[PDB]
């Protein structure tokens, strides 16, 4: 297979205004949503049809009743770190877990956290330690490090049990995730080269210029892979043209596999 | 579904050493527990494994392979405290606990 | 420092009797469970409550109910006894969800015979 990720976040807010949720729960797999939890619903949801068809109401009941621990949990914790700050007014705080299973067979496993939408703590399963940005990290870091059970058991899942879901969910989704839609790439003047591509799937896609055969990437202008809204995306990629010597460019783009060029006459 | 097996009884003498053994079977693996239950008594917290390999506390270490789905209680040097039931416990991919029956451990004088 | 404390030790009932069993620690725990132990099995979750605020069935919750009244206490209900229920009832409670390392703390169980 191409290379597939699964991740959960977390988002807890101190003071949020009125509605908007204390906490808020999505897992992804690649770039697609597959569930959700906010402090209003107190609900585990699924957010792609291929989990709802999948998974039994025994799990979202369980996952739902874990959230709701979760949540509390997380409440603390973001109390306890704007404490810790001497902060007044509303604060966030975040997480986020996740395993990568690459094309290669190899897998990657990651577990950090962000206060106020900065890195705060980062695991390291490898030597088994949290890295502290800073000094109330520190002290959380103290802690967290003398419960060793819990960090063994953290690497566990991002090693094993992370790995078994992901493997899980990319065959109830294997026919959203695993297709490929080949994009669409045309070169237009607006003065520079536009190379744009759209109706592609999956997101991952390198666009580029050479100018004769050479790629000049600090004068490349890179446009993001944006969602169409049907499922598929688009991109784009530019570079201006010298009006005082004739160039040959060329656009290039990969896609899953496939390579095409696109030479401006 | 999920099972974990353990022996009913075990019988050994004082002084002796035990390997009381935990084989399991689940939907996914979140680390195994071992709990002293003297008769009569609570339950109380013994051992915690997740990773591979043995782990020592005092007279006690646990074991696990989790490729082989195993884990044992060793007791070394035992007495006639050590007299009572011992219940491993899993927890599957979903955080449920699955409790063995126990393993009653008898000891000789 | 008491950890978990529940009541009664030991209760006979006659079939259809109402039976209330009380938990509560002082863990400062957020999660709590009752349990039922039988002679050739392992325990078996009645109920559990992950937080204060939230209930949801164990493994045989039939014809059991509980209450998680506060984050100290999380009492189980027997509103029609039954003698299949006879059995002996441990409450126990961990520091956070079950999810984790984290291991459970027990109470020291109520004995309950039912009997026509």
């Known amino acids: 297979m191409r290379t597939h990720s699964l991740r959960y976040f977390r988002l807890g807010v101190s003071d949020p205004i009125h509605g908007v949720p204390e906490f808020i729960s999505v897992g992804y797999v690649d770039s697609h949503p597959i569930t959700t939890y906010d402090s209003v619903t107190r609900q585990k949801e699924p957010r792609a049809p291929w989990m709802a068809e999948n998974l039994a109401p025994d799990h979202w009941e369980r996952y739902t009743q874990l959230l709701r621990g979760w949540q509390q949990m997380f409440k603390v914790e973001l109390k306890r770190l704007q404490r810790h700050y001497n902060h007044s007014g509303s604060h966030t705080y975040q997480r986020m877990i996740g395993c990568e299973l690459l094309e290669d067979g190899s897998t990657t496993g990651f577990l950090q956290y962000a206060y106020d939408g900065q890195d705060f703590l980062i695991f390291n399963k490898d030597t088994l330690s949290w890295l502290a940005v800073d000094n109330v990290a520190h002290t959380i870091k103290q802690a967290w490090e003398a419960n060793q059970h819990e960090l063994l058991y953290q690497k566990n899942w991002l090693e094993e049990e992370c790995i078994a879901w992901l493997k899980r969910f990319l065959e109830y989704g294997k026919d959203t995730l695993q297709r490929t839609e080949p994009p669409l790439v045309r070169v237009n003047r607006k003065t520079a080269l536009f190379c744009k591509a759209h109706g592609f799937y999956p997101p991952e896609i390198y666009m580029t210029w050479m100018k004769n055969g050479e790629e000049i990437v600090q004068e490349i202008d890179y446009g993001d892979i944006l969602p169409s809204g049907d499922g598929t995306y688009q991109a784009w990629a530019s570079i201006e043209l010298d009006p005082q010597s004739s160039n040959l460019y060329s656009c290039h783009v990969e896609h899953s596999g496939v390579h095409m060029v696109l030479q401006v006459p | 579904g999920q099972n974990i097996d353990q022996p009913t009884e075990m019988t050994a003498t004082e002084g002796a050493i035990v390997q009381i053994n935990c084989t399991y079977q689940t939907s996914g693996f979140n680390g195994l527990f071992w709990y002293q239950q003297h008769a009569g008594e609570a339950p109380t917290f013994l051992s915690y494994?997740?990773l591979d390999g043995l782990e020592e506390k005092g007279r006690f270490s646990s074991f696990l392979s989790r490729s082989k789905g195993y884990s044992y209680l060793l007791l070394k040097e035992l007495q006639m405290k050590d007299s009572a039931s011992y219940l491993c416990a899993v927890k599957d991919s979903n955080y449920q606990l699955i409790w063995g029956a126990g393993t009653k451990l008898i000891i000789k004088p | 420092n008491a950890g978990v404390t529940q009541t009664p030790k030991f209760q006979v009932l006659k079939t259809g009797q109402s039976m209330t069993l009380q938990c509560a620690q002082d863990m400062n725990h957020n999660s709590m469970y009752w349990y039922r132990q039988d002679p050739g099995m392992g325990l078996r979750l009645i109920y559990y409550?992950?937080?204060?605020?939230?209930?949801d069935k164990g493994e045989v919750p039939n014809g059991y109910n509980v209450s998680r009244l506060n984050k100290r206490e999380f009492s189980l209900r027997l509103e029609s006894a039954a003698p299949s229920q006879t059995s002996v009832y441990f409450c126990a409670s961990s520091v956070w969800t079950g999810e984790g390392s984290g291991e459970l703390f027990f109470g020291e169980g109520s004995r309950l015979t039912v009997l026509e």
């Open positions: 494994n997740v």
């Open positions: 409550s992950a937080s204060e605020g939230t209930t």
